[PDB]
Design a protein around this nucleic acid. Structure first.
Ligand SMILES: [Mg+2]
Ligand SMILES: [Mg+2]
Ligand SMILES: [Mg+2]
Ligand SMILES: [Mg+2]
Ligand SMILES: [Mg+2]
Ligand SMILES: [Mg+2]
Lengths: 126, 140
RNA sequence: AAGAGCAUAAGUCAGCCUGACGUUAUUCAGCAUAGCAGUGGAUGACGAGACGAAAGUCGGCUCUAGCGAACUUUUGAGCC
RNA sequence: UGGGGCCCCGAAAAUUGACGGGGCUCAAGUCGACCACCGAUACCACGGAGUACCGCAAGGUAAUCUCGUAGGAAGGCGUUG
RNA sequence: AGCUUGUAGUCCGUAAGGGAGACAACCCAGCCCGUGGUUAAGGUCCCCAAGUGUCGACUAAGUGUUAAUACUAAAGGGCGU
RNA sequence: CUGGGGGGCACCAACCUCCAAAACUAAAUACUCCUUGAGACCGAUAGCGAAAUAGUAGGGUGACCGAACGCUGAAAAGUACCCCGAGAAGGGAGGUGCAAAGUGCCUGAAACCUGAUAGUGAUGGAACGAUACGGCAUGAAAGGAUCUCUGGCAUGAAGGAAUCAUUCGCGAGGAUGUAGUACGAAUGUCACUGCCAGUGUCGUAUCUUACGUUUUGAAGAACGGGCCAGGGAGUGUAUCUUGGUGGCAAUGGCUAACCUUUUAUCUGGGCAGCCGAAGCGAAAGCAACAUGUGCGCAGCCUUUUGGCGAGGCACGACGUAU
RNA sequence: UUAUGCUAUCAGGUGGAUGGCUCGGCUCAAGAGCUUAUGAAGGACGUGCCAAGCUGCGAUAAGCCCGGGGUAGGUG
């Protein structure tokens, strides 16, 4: 975290993003898992180019009972067939309803980082 | 431009003070210089000279709205939930003129039983609809 | 014109012919490197032919000059 | 008689005057060598500032970072409300 | 022709500081601030810091005492040395 | 009237639709001489030309052009009486007032002018200064007191002798040993002293031919400025394109005019409409993959070598035009 | 006592900057909106005890009469 990452952090305004970035770097140092450092560097990118993932893509690529990190927002467009865990930064209301009806979960990045200390089997999507 | 960035610069980011005189430092006013000295820029912008084709009157022409069979199939449960469609004896009876669509295309898959009534049907849309056991009615 | 090419020939003569064909895609130079019309020249593709036992050659005259956008009128085939 | 080094004649311009000047003759000139010393912000050492990149921070690396016009970019000072 | 028009390298333009009498572009050097040290180009009779230095010869004309250089005279002759 | 007109080239037919060549008609709207209210407005070279004896003084035959000028104090309490003077001038003394603020009188800068103080000065060379060392003058406050001055001791990086001896060289001198020694920026420590920092001016040594601009090139015999104060130059509407940060998100996003305004805010409505969602083609018209294959970054698993592998890249297949 | 001068600071003159104040200006919003032959707007001249300009007024001339409000001073 040289002056470069400090500048990219200073641009942000939403407090939750800043707290996430700092805590992710701390947890990455704690567990020696590069997953959290990767997610931090992704969240620290330009806000114009974040990820917006539709339900169809998750249905296309994942399988039964996977765990998913989406540094962006999950949008509801398509049909979800099987249970999935999608810990993402934000959900739209239709996406939340579809994932709940399918039988999955919609837990934020804080909950996933607290529950799993190491990300032993997490799949990053974009 | 950032005026405070240039307090003490004199030229204010223009080079010599002999630039920024008027319209002759831009090559003319407007899109002026069509093909003498701005021809390459004229071709790259999308302002090439010429007239090509004709137009029909807007009285007679129409612009049809479209919906693919995949889209119509996927959101069928929501359609019957909103009371738009109908579910007598299982097969969905969906009428396209209440939604506001005048033609059904054929991109996508169809698995549910659909009884679709509308004005127009591409050949592949009809083929896909009837390969799933459904029926299509030319709504008149 | 100037330069380059050519000998069982790219030259001279005879026989038979009209490829001096319709349509179409790239790449090169004009315009090194490094944007820029139209337009030309090299490979090809589809459809028809000429000569020749066949292989092959033929998209004019051995290669590099002989030419011009938009708008407008006229002409050709079929359509909107 | 031929081949070389230095010098002389050939050689006259306009305000008074230009080896930088004084001056200099086994030289304070020319030719071939040599020794010692002087002389920069260059190079060496020490301390300090800034910058680039990395690191959670502490901090770490820089012989391979520190000139600058047209010009691009980043952070700050001031005036009135 | 310090002329005009090309080309390769490097410079001035936009380049401090040291030395050339002064010198846009010639030689050393590409430069954050302070202190000590040793050198480069160039110099060491006085102006002016450091040699009236060493060895072997030449010049008698104040010739010369002027790296490059837009700033420095030729053919010819001399029983001058 | 068994009539007439229209339906974006003329005529024919069907169908749809209307009755000109006469006339009137409130409300919703536009504007500001004028009245009221409000202000991220200007604050006396600004704001209207005019803080109005301002369209005035003044200028032009005329059409017409057109300035400068605000401020005593709480209260005039607006300087009694005396001397000088030709004096209804003015000066001195003496009063009023917290304070002369003494009449165009709040504060009272610079240019410019008069006097005084410090430095220097009638043998002397110039971009008016920077750096180091000295003379003279000052150094009350806001700056120092292990601070200023002078010395002793300990450690000391790069560098590093003198002197003497041996030896080499025609010689100027070199090499070895004395010696990486004595010293050496600085870092600590113990006594000693009352100055130092700073400011003005003059002298000595090195360096520098002002500043902006046009120029390949500026100290120029190229242009601009006598000096001082104040004023003085990237702004708004519409539209297109692209970044940093956000809201919502294919069951898409946003409303416009307007209504509720209870004074311009604000809360709640407002689905007309615009962009996105399907393209190709002049047009008629026709109308696509909701993953078939491979390479593989990040990340994860693992025998640390391989495996899975979102996004990325390369194919294959399909819609339409020719 | 070095004259004529040069540099810096101080005291005074001239001048009117800066600061503070401001019955003025400007912009927006809400209202209101015709008048004159029964002689208008505009102009010339006059009008005050001491009165030149502006303002008001018209030989009844900084003005006259009536009704209401207001109350002890008035003479732009
Ligand atoms: Mg610049
Ligand atoms: Mg350079
Ligand atoms: Mg120099
Ligand atoms: Mg004014
Ligand atoms: Mg220039
Ligand atoms: Mg000013």
């Amino acid at each position: 975290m040289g002056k470069k990452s400090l500048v990219k952090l200073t641009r942000k305004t939403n407090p939750r993003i800043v707290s996430l970035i700092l805590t992710l770097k701390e947890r990455a140092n704690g567990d020696s898992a590069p997953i959290w450092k990767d997610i931090a560097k992704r969240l620290e990118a330009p806000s114009r180019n974040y990820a917006a993932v539709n339900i169809s893509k998750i249905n296309r690529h994942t399988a039964e009972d996977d765990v998913l990190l989406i540094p962006g927002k999950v949008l509801g467009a398509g049909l979800l067939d099987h249970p999935v865990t999608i810990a993402a930064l934000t959900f739209s209301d239709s996406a939340f309803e579809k994932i709940t009806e399918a039988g999955g979960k919609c837990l934020s990045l804080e909950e996933i980082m607290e529950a799993n200390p190491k990300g032993s089997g997490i799949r990053i999507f974009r | 431009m950032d005026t405070k960035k240039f307090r003490g610069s004199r030229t204010c980011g223009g080079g010599t003070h002999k630039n920024r005189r008027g319209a002759g430092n831009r090559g003319g006013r407007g899109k002026a210089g069509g093909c003498k000295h701005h021809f390459v820029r004229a071709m790259m912008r999308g302002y090439s000279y010429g007239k090509h084709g004709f137009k029909r009157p807007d009285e007679v022409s129409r612009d049809v709205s479209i919906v693919n069979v995949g889209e119509l199939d996927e959101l069928a449960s929501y359609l019957v939930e909103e009371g738009l469609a109908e579910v007598k004896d299982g097969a969905y009876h969906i009428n396209l003129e209440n939604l506001g669509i005048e033609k059904v295309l054929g991109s996508g898959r169809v698995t549910k039983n659909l009884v679709v009534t509308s004005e127009e049907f591409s050949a592949s849309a009809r083929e896909k609809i009837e390969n799933a056991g459904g029926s299509c009615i030319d709504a008149e």
